[PDB]
Amino acid sequence: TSQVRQNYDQDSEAAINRQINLELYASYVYLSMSYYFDRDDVALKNFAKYFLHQSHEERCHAEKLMKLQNQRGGRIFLQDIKKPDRDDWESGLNAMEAALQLEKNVNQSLLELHKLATDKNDPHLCDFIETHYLNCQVCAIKCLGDHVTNLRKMGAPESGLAEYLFDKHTLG
Amino acid sequence: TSQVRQNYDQDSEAAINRQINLELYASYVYLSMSYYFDRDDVALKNFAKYFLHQSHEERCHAEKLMKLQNQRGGRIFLQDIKKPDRDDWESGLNAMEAALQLEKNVNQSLLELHKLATDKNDPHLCDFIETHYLNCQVCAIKCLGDHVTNLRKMGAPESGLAEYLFDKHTLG
Amino acid sequence: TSQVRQNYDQDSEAAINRQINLELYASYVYLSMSYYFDRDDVALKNFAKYFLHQSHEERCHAEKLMKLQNQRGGRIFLQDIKKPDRDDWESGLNAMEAALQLEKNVNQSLLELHKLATDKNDPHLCDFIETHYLNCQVCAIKCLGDHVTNLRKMGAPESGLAEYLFDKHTLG
Amino acid sequence: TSQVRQNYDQDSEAAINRQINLELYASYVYLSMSYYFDRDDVALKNFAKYFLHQSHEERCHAEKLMKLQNQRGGRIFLQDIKKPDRDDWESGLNAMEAALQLEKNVNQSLLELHKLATDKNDPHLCDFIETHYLNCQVCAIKCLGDHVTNLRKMGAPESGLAEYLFDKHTLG
Amino acid sequence: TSQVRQNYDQDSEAAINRQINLELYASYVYLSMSYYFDRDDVALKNFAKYFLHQSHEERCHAEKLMKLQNQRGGRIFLQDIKKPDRDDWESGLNAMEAALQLEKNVNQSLLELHKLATDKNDPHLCDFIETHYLNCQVCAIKCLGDHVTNLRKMGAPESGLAEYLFDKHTLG
Amino acid sequence: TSQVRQNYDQDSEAAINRQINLELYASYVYLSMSYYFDRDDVALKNFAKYFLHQSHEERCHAEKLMKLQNQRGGRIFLQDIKKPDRDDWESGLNAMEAALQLEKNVNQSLLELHKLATDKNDPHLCDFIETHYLNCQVCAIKCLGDHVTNLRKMGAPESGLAEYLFDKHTLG
Ligand SMILES: [Ca+2]
Ligand SMILES: [Hg+2]
Ligand SMILES: [Hg+2]
Ligand SMILES: [Hg+2]
Ligand SMILES: [Hg+2]
Ligand SMILES: [Hg+2]
Ligand SMILES: [Hg+2]
Ligand SMILES: [Zn+2]
Ligand SMILES: [Zn+2]
């Protein structure tokens, strides 16, 4: 048993390692989307950038979660990073919609993780999430949603001019 | 025989002069395209500005090639510079496609020139091409590729508005 | 077929996607080592840092490889990121030795990739590697080796004072 | 007909296209002399440097001419750019003598062009020439004239020291 | 066997050591030429200064090569540095012609070394020569070639004035 | 004879030429040592660092000696530079001792040189020796002496930790 461990439950420890992988996954998904728009037949540099940043952000959440693990005394155990669902994300609107779902999912995962920490009376963990992931996911979803909304209302996905202008004005 | 000549094959010497003309040619095409967009009936400054820059760029590659010839003891032999294939390039999309094919042929020419250098066992020549040219072409083509894609997805050439916004946003 | 593709062979394309995963893998391995030293029972912040940077560097190679893919016209296809071998890396010396092998491996993979590009006459690819990965791997190995050497000669792994001082003076 | 054309005669438009070609030609010539001195057996950097600047100048002149065509409503028509009269320019004194002749020829047709505009009662065309070429050309001739005179009086071509010191003192 | 060794053939290893001597040799030659012009009966400070730089340059090339030897895992084996051919270099033109011959021989050696690395499928060793040596040599040669041309043309070595003036203007 | 020669004996001259070689030799010795510690199985940068500097220090001493020869009308006569009597230096301690001896010999050599100068009544040569060498060598030896002392009292060569710490705390 780690000398620093205190009030950190086994389920929580596992829950985290699990959350860690989901984050690494999310990062991989975003990495996949980024380079989809980098393709000469898609060509939307800002979508590409937007997503790559989104990618780097998730890998950062992953690492911060790993830090938490070591801080509490729990041991980290890595699992394969599943490959993303698709390989082709169609249009900018599809990618956004996809991302909106992914976030809503990761958020679902976090809320479950919070309930777990509440049933285990781990105030420190509940807080670490409330401040570092909860309000973050809420802002991410709301943004994604807005993009989805504007893209639909601009004529996308059928309209190629719409995504172009979106890549410029909103993501640029 | 030049006092500095060393391991520089005569076939190689001819290949470069050949390339020095292809480069000068491309420069001429790009110039033609430039001032095409400068017409009061075309009026797309940024396209014109763009192609003028490429015309100036190719012209330099032609010069770097000539410096190379001299460095290695070879002797430069210039030829006429054939007039560009067309006089009117129709639309910005059409011009971009025209350009994409051009840069593709020059790369083609370089890739051949490279095999020739290899066959003649001239590493310095192989290297000079790899660094100063090969990479550039690969990038140029990828950029022209992207431009062609965007203009398309926007509705060009039919949509006069697509070529306008592209000129402003992408090339401006 | 991608409009930008030219002289880019199918085997090469595959070879890359494969090299991409190996890089992502390497990054994961290094990520695993970093947080091993972050553990309160290992406690070597600089080893942790050293490795995390090494981790970020590899993920960067991965992305740059993905860029190449899109530049040449080849399509990217992601594969699961296998999980690292161990979970516990024992000592700083073990981690270094491990890393030395990993690099030597990734380098082996790159050299094979180079021979492939040579058999396919893709000067652009041979070069992209010669300049962005070859000389890089050689410097990485030589460094790792030096650390391994100093750690052995300082009394590690049996000596706990040796690794401590190494974390300070060399990695700090 | 161009929506902007006004008082621009067909003979003039043709004469301009003709003048454009001559300028691009002179440019080639200079480019030629430029890399002549860049040869290891001629080795006169400044002569090289000088003529290169001249080459760029004549090209800048061609572009201005084209810009004019578009402005007045005419239509540019490019023709092949014949190769320089020679490949080897012998000595500095010879090239200076060669240029002097070239600029005078160019100046010649320019005057012809001005005479034409005068007959076609096109005040604008005469004024454009009056300021952007007739003045440059007179100075150009006077300069080369001065150069030739100096080289002759110093010893060229009998003296190799003459060209060397003229390279450093006048052109450097 | 060095833990860092990989795809580094024993022939290459031995070739490198041999080349290391050749470089140190040139350094000694250039050092001999440097002080030759420092003699009161020769008195050409820039010639002296010029060659001293080449001597220092070559030693640097030597050192780099030794670092390569160590980075690849090979082992350095020094040999005697055979003194230069003469003690008197007659004239500046004589010295410049010799140095041209030397760089040309050192370049020839480098070419043989590059073929060996290729024949031994060692991309890293091939590329290392491509950048840090092969390109420098073609340049060194072309410069020497030029210095030799001017000195000739200025009337050397019969004319003492020529070298004095070359010393001040080119090398000064 | 040299117009500048004046009270510079024959034996003195030959002696300096002799000293010049010894200094060059010492330089080659340190060069050897330097790259020994640069080996991946020795890995002691600062030692590598330290000796490489001394190598240059000695080579400079050589050059100033050659400048002396020319300053006084003597003629320089370079000889082969024998390789070091060692390839592998075993340890930092052994190497430091080797250096110490080496320096004492060169000092011994300089002391004999100063003697010759006195028996030949040459105050300039004597003074030259005093201010530019005799004084450096003493300090040098004293420094090398101190280094040996520290390494020995630190537990060298059996303690790898000692040399490692000396490398960081004294040579760093
Ligand atoms: Ca005294
Ligand atoms: Hg809680
Ligand atoms: Hg080659
Ligand atoms: Hg290749
Ligand atoms: Hg007029
Ligand atoms: Hg090779
Ligand atoms: Hg004395
Ligand atoms: Zn807009
Ligand atoms: Zn310490």
Q: Is E1 on the interface with C (CB under 8 A)?
A: no
At position C66, the amino acid (one-letter code) is M
Q: Could C4 and A73 be called an inter-chain contact, meaning their C-beta atoms sit closer than 8 Å?
A: no
Facing C4 at nearest CB: one of B126, B129, B145: B145
Q: What 3-state DSSP class applies to E169? A: helix
Q: Is C70 on the interface with A (CB under 8 A)?
A: yes
Instruction: Answer whether B31's CB lies under 8 Å from D79's CB.
Output: no
Burial of D168 (0-12, 13-18, 19+ CB in 10 A): middle
Facing E142 at nearest CB: one of D40, D42, D164: D40
Q: How many residues does chain C have?
A: 172
Instruction: Answer whether D39's CB lies under 8 Å from E145's CB.
Output: no
Chain E residues with CB under 8 Å of B124 CB are 130, 134-135, 137-138
What is the resolution in angstroms? 3.1
Give me ligand 1 centre to Cα F121, in Å. Answer: 11
CA distance F139 to F136: 5
Facing B146 at nearest CB: one of A43, A161, A163: A43
CA distance C141 to C156: 20
Does residue C7 come out as left (phi exceeding 0), alpha (psi in the -120 to 50 range) or beta? left
**Residue from D159, D34, D29 nearest D85 by CA:** D29
Method: X-ray
**Residue from C78, C84, C80, C24 nearest C56 by CA:** C24
Instruction: Answer whether C33's CB lies under 8 Å from C99's CB.
Output: yes
Contacts of D8 (CB under 8 A, 6+ apart): D72, D73, D74, D122, D125
**Residue from D87, D78, D74 nearest D24 by CA:** D78
At position D151, the amino acid (one-letter code) is L
Residue F157, preceding peptide bond in cis (omega within 30° of 0):
yes
Instruction: Answer whether A141's CB lies under 8 Å from A103's CB.
Output: yes
Does residue F150 come out as left (phi exceeding 0), alpha (psi in the -120 to 50 range) or beta? alpha
CA distance E60 to E101: 20
Neighboring chains of C (3 or more beta-carbon pairs < 8 A): A, B, E, F
Q: Could C153 and F168 be called an inter-chain contact, meaning their C-beta atoms sit closer than 8 Å?
A: no
Instruction: Answer whether B154's CB lies under 8 Å from A164's CB.
Output: yes
CA distance C10 to B135: 20
CA distance D161 to D44: 12
Smallest CA–CA distance from D161 into chain E, residue: E154
**Residue from B128, B107, B104 nearest B117 by CA:** B128
At position E17, the amino acid (one-letter code) is N
**Residue from D61, D77, D79, D74 nearest D136 by CA:** D61
Smallest CA–CA distance from A39 into chain B, residue: B146
Burial of D119 (0-12, 13-18, 19+ CB in 10 A): exposed
CA distance C130 to E117: 14
Contacts of B26 (CB under 8 A, 6+ apart): B58, B102, B103, B106
Contacts of E156 (CB under 8 A, 6+ apart): E91, E92, E93, E162, E163, E166
**Residue from A151, A6, A26, A163 nearest A81 by CA:** A26
CA distance A130 to C144: 41
Facing C142 at nearest CB: one of F40, F42, F160: F40
Residue D81 phi/psi, 5-degree rounding, is: -105, 100
DSSP 8-class letter at A42: T
Closest CA of chain E from D43, distance in Å: 5
3-state percent helix, strand, coil for chain D, nearest multiple of 5: 70, 0, 25
Closest CA of chain B from E121, distance in Å: 14
CA distance B130 to B68: 14
Q: Report the b/e string of B75-89 with b at 16+ CB within 10 A.
A: ebbbeebebbeeeeb
**Residue from B68, B36, B70 nearest B52 by CA:** B36
Helices (H), chain E: 10-36, 45-72, 92-119, 123-129, 135-153, 160-169
How many domains does the structure of chain E reveal?
Answer: 1
- What pairs with residue C81 in β-bridges? A81
Q: Among all chains, which residue has been given the structure tokens 């760093």?
A: F172
- What pairs with residue E81 in β-bridges? F81
Helices (H), C38-159: 45-72, 92-119, 123-129, 135-154
Contacts 24+ apart (CB under 8 A), F52-57: F52/E63, F54/F30, F54/F99, F55/F27, F55/F28, F55/F29, F55/F30, F55/F31, F56/F27
Q: Among all chains, which residue has been given the structure tokens 């690794």?
A: C163
DSSP 8-class letter at E12: H
What separation in angstroms does the CA of F92 have from each of E73, F41, F138? 20, 13, 21
Instruction: Answer whether F12's CB lies under 8 Å from F117's CB.
Output: yes
Tokens of B20: 């020095």
Q: What 3-state DSSP class applies to F10? A: helix
Q: How many residues does chain F have?
A: 172
Instruction: Answer whether F118's CB lies under 8 Å from F141's CB.
Output: no
Helix axes of F92-119 and F135-154: crossing angle, nearest 10 degrees: 160
Cα of D58 vs its chain's centroid, Å: 5
CA distance E105 to E22: 9
Known binding-site residue numbers of F for Fe cation: 23, 58, 61, 103, 137
CA distance C115 to C120: 9
Residue E167 phi/psi, 5-degree rounding, is: -60, -40
Contacts of D146 (CB under 8 A, 6+ apart): none
Give me ligand 4 centre to Cα B77, in Å. Answer: 29
CATH number at residue A134: 1.20.1260.10
CA distance D50 to D66: 25
Give me ligand 2 centre to Cα A69, in Å. Answer: 17
Give me ligand 5 centre to Cα D130, in Å. Answer: 10
CA distance E92 to E10: 41
Ligand nearest to the CA of E122: 6
End-to-end CA distance of chain E: 50
Give me ligand 2 centre to Cα C35, in Å. Answer: 26
Instruction: Answer whether B70's CB lies under 8 Å from D42's CB.
Output: no
Chain C residues with CB under 8 Å of A70 CB are 35, 38-40
Does residue B70 come out as left (phi exceeding 0), alpha (psi in the -120 to 50 range) or beta? alpha
CA distance D3 to D9: 14
**Residue from A36, A30, A147, A163 nearest A84 by CA:** A30
CA distance B37 to D67: 11
Q: What 3-state DSSP class applies to E81? A: strand
**Residue from B23, E60, E7 nearest C112 by CA:** E7
Q: How many residues does chain B have?
A: 172
Instruction: Answer whether E77's CB lies under 8 Å from F87's CB.
Output: yes
Give me ligand 1 centre to Cα F15, in Å. Answer: 19
Instruction: Answer whether C169's CB lies under 8 Å from C151's CB.
Output: no
User: Does C137 count as an annotated binding residue?
Assistant: yes
Secondary structure (H, E, C), B79-135? CCECCCCCCCCCCHHHHHHHHHHHHHHHHHHHHHHHHHHHHCCCHHHHHHHHHHHHH
Does residue C76 come out as left (phi exceeding 0), alpha (psi in the -120 to 50 range) or beta? beta
What is the residue range of C170's domain? 1-172
Geometric angle at alpha carbon A58, from C132 and B146, rounded to 5° = 55
Chain C residues with CB under 8 Å of B140 CB are none
Q: Report the b/e string of D55-90 with b at 16+ CB within 10 A.
A: bbbbbebbbebbebbbbbbbbbbbeebebbeeeebe
Q: Could E130 and B123 be called an inter-chain contact, meaning their C-beta atoms sit closer than 8 Å?
A: yes
**Residue from C62, C59, C30 nearest C47 by CA:** C30
Q: What 3-state DSSP class applies to C56? A: helix
User: Does C23 count as an annotated binding residue?
Assistant: yes
Instruction: Answer whether C135's CB lies under 8 Å from E128's CB.
Output: yes
CA distance C94 to C44: 14
Instruction: Answer whether A29's CB lies under 8 Å from A74's CB.
Output: no
End-to-end CA distance of chain D: 50
Interface of F with C in 35-64 (CB under 8 A): 40-43
Other CB atoms within a 10 A radius of the CB of residue E39 amount to: 20
CA distance E119 to E126: 10
Residue F81 phi/psi, 5-degree rounding, is: -110, 105
